[model samples]
Target: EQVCDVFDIYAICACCKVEVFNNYTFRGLGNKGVLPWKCNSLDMKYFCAVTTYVNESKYEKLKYKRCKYLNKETKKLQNVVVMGRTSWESIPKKFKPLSNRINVILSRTLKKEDFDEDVYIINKVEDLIVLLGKLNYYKCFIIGGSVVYQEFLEKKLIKKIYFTRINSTYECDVFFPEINENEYQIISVSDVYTSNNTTLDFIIYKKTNNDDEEEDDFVYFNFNKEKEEKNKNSIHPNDFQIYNSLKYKYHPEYQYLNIIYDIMMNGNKQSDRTGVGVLSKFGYIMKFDLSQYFPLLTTKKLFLRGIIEELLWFIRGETNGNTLLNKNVRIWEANGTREFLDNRKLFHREVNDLGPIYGFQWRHFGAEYTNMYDNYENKGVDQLKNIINLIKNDPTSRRILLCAWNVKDLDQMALPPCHILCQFYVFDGKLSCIMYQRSCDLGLGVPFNIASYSIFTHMIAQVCNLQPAQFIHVLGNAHVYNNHIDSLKIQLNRIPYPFPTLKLNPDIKNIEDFTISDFTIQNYVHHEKISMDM
Candidate 1:
């Protein structure tokens, strides 16, 4: 039996070119001495059978070679390559010239079973490695629409990628896969500014195999002790203590009632923008400007200590959930250790903590040691400062960006980020932030989101010497949780007050050097608290 290796996988759009079919030709002779040469007028029946047989056989052979080669080379295999179904009659006569060089396969359904005789072909990406194990193909190339690319990209299975960046944007429904710089390192650009009607750049990326073995470092905190101390010193305290006390006191009330109402009735709605209905109702109660002050929930008794500890832990670049667990905090409990503990046998072992989540993505990102600082100098501090400075200096460069969504690390996360990614646009010395949140739990999470990002905005503005502009939140799924409706109505019934001013210690010079302790809020007061259902 003759064997062949097909290393290149081409994703050609049928409408774009008729060259593949037009240049088809055949030369090989079969065992029966029946050499079927290319013909423009070949009947559909004969064409379908012959082409399907040839292509299927060739694909099987190629798959075998890829599997064996990749296994030997890297001890890892990935079955790749999927051809879309095409009608035999749909083959253009122009393609008849290249019949011998390329074999066309046909299938009524692209189901997994149809390709079982050849190689693995399943829909879910979770089965990719298993499929590779079955077929024994270690390294494979994936080619398809943006959906296919995104599916694999989300799983971080793609090791090497070749993107032909064209100068002119094609207004097609398809899109290139999203990639993170931390996971795939850009190897080279084969062609830069090519003369193919549109300027094309060929960029190559290689996947990092060392990812699976890395450890995550996340921190958690318990406020029992801190809360006790605050209660002891509630009457009189220092500047920092006073601020913390007020925030702690006011956080729960805002969280339970007012924040809930704002999220449910007014969230991302233009009508709410008019400052009417529930928003207007709360606006009157709180005496705060809806447009100015972000209505972060201060009610429902937030685990303020937990949130602050988590932020500090993130800034520290730690991923182990133990830090949070040590303090008796359990935010990560649901998906982390708690999940593992619940299904000990299925998960195989009990871990003290869950793998990293947002903090890991924000700080360490891809693998354990994939320091973002390596790419840009000064631990990416210079780049961060440069972005801020650009806002102050040019403002209209349209390149203000900050990325936290690292695709490769998504699989290991306890849960994907609620706030997946964010960017800033600077114009006329005003920095406006745009946040892309994949999912928002309006009752429990949205308020925190607003406060966190708004704080981030304030810090960035302060550093760059630019005025803070709008903080735009674009959510993939912004819905009120099924359970938190009653609290929402009550908060809507109450009035809103002016947002207290936040004062960062002026002594803090550099953005990177500032810690949480370097911040303070002034004259923060609120009305009576309302009960909430978490």
Candidate 2:
């Protein structure tokens, strides 16, 4: 869904009641990055009072309030409203940083100098913890934009959600992430109020404790040595698989879902590079037949545009995150942030300067590392072009491969390529691809890999005058993050719709010439989206 619980200072301190409400809340947020319905002054008043109001009795409950800069020396210590960059921008310019609260804006691209010193601009979820650690604040409320809300929800950070239930639904492009009712209980509800001919009620929700409850759906296998030694009767992963036979054998998307099911049942708990721990399974494989249908997951709708734009960026061998951002494909923004670049010790690279990543490696492999702005024309060996050429000239060659895992450029990259090596195969006038991913985030990243490479195979086949066949995905470390377990379980329960058919523009012979418009998918009916923390 999103990222960190930076408000731990307030969360652990019972006095500070943290609630996501009004525009900061998901349900009452907006359509197309702005408030969906007509603005209600009463709702605004309620939001202000709730976040700004500080209980004197509760303030006294904080034990360590006097820690230098962290001193609650003054009554100026007001509530903190955490919001995504979009939500901050949505506020009227005059009310830029909402009065009476510490405004923390979550964004990777926003420059610190651009805003007033009073405004706090944080890049990552982890930064919030460090930022709040030194600040003296009362309540902390996560405000809107769907992405931010979802992130907090998935992380199980928010203890309460002050949801404002509106009567009408506007044509909303962005809506609040659905709260799991099983996990939350409605504590209080206010009487209906009419504003702008619309009726609404204030609802206060407290997270319910379901920790002791056991789910009967999937068998959870804890492979921890201590746990195993304590209980030998725990069902083995193989036994679980044998019991849960071919549940979703018909659908091609199941190739992806089955892995999730497997990981859910049997994955070993392990530490990860990302602070979030993962339940991982090593050495997994999935095969998708792209001869007739596309491999896009039908359980949850995929952002096809972002996927296409990203692949186009990769094919062109571009490394700058700004290019994708310009195309409205912001998947790379997180990695390109100043905080992230600095964390990776990439002080030399500017913001959005993802040096020698997938695209750069794909087009210009082994090229000398440089900033994103440099021209890479005829610089390194063009693996993509060579692969296409190999398929066209010597169809049976075993050496047609593209490698993104350049050891030399590892330190310079924003993030190491996960879906690392890809090999092209030609047999009986049909083209196929086999990709090896060292690390796969099954919930969020795998679907994109499946679709990207499948489409890529098709693109290459078209250019090489061959028909598209199968896509073989070999993963070294396939995993589902602990935060995404519930979301993936929900996804696994849904029945997959028919796989969509991909239609590539017949005229586009060159791989570089294939724009986002050149590719179209038909009849991609899917179940409701399941949001997962990235």
Candidate 3:
């Protein structure tokens, strides 16, 4: 759940050197800095003049026409105030009405000691959450000069920002902190109606951390195991007959019985595919083990380059299309040109073609390594082998990491690397791999990704000479694309019994030396070809 809250500006103020008493301004001052002085004295008169200017500004700015000042005794601004500060007094005077409506809380001194007892003294923007949590305010807004706005921005505390961009840029020493665009989403822009002879726009921005509205409680069920057993243990004569026929025809030892079950049940009964669908619907874990069995869909044909190239590109960290083009891959050619068009503003292009997507990012990301021309090296396959060796030798190093998402280059990615990163662990003489995919397009991408990674895992297992362990795939945002729903249903209707055995040529020893031909599926058979959405 994203945090959402609104804060309203309550006051504005200017600094004064002397203290005054018994005036309309003095009445609003809290107990903090009030000083008794003789009338007409130099210090008292100067104090009175500053007080008069502040009070008059408050009257002009605030609709309520009242200013709440710091208490003389408590040395804290009243709860009714919002804080703002600037070196020049003229800035606050311009927003005359706002100044009057809200109390201008003064920073008594720049010394850190002054904030020791003030509840309003926010050392960090996150501290505001603590303060608000204690106060239990349902909503709050921050009215600010540069300092206040910057504090909130740096700490990532502000959820919504209301900006009224004026026609002119005022020359001033103080300025608000530049916002990090990745952290916020621009919701709306006001029409460009002329205001004060200058074209101005009002923009509303909401923090990304506060925009999520989904519930986190997820429920999962192992439908595959249950259904597999149910079909195997069926007592009904009709069920037994159908099962036996499928077993004999498809050679059940090699083909998945669950797929046959689904076909026999005519999509009415739940199988592993349907169970996986159900679990996916509830946002449960969908794992792929590279070492055990390849997860390629025998149900339909797949675009190998679309998946393989994408994996390669992600490892390369390439964002733009030039790299792919140089390699004779134009998957993103339909998108646009690859050049410094528009002065680097419109240079990056993408093709609408759906081929392998990983190669572009894995081999040549423009913005990841400081040098765009330099290669972003990712020896993932090699790294996997090293991890095996490390486990065999050290067995205790927890540094086996293979990352796909280069945080610095996320913005330059063609599409953020889906199968973003992975890590490996070794324990009890076994090697395990944990994958972190930033996003998963379940139907078209998940299967190939699972199969390819699993193949890689097996190769690593063979090279490292370690027992292959579990492969854990952790997805951050797994979703069924709008185009793949029907394919998913078709897949679910097919039963998946035991996975077919994958045989690798025993002669292949090195992990890097194993080519596509080194592996083959044995006794593989399947039901009728199932149609897919994409």
lDDT of all predictions: 0.44, 0.72, 0.43
Give the TM-scores of the predictions, in the order they appear: 0.41, 0.55, 0.39
Which parts of model 2 have CA positions greater than 4 angstroms off?
A: 1-248
Residue pairs clashing in model 2 are 1-151, 1-532, 1-533, 2-151, 24-143, 24-144, 26-176
Better of 1 and 2 by lDDT: 2
Query: How do the residues 1-534 of candidate 1 rate in per-residue lDDT, one tens digit apiece?
Result: 111123433221111111011101111111121112222121223223322233343556666665675564332323344422332222355643223222223233566454323333354544544444445332244434444555556655554664433322222323344456466544443312213232222335555435553343222334234354443222222322212222112322343343344454344432333343221111111221122343344233333446655665655555556667887767665565656545533253235433444554554444443321222113323334556667777777766665555676555555556776667777666677887777565656765666667667777777777667677766555555434556655444332232334456666555666675776543233345544464
* Between candidates 1 and 2, the TM-score winner: 2
lDDT of 2 by residue, 225-287 (tens): 445444322334443332243222544566687788777767788886657788888997888
Query: What's model 2's TM-score?
Result: 0.55
Clashes of each: 52, 7, 63
Residue 199 lDDT (model 3): 30
lDDT of 1 at 428: 67
Off by over 4 Å in 1: 1-305, 325-329, 338-356, 368-394
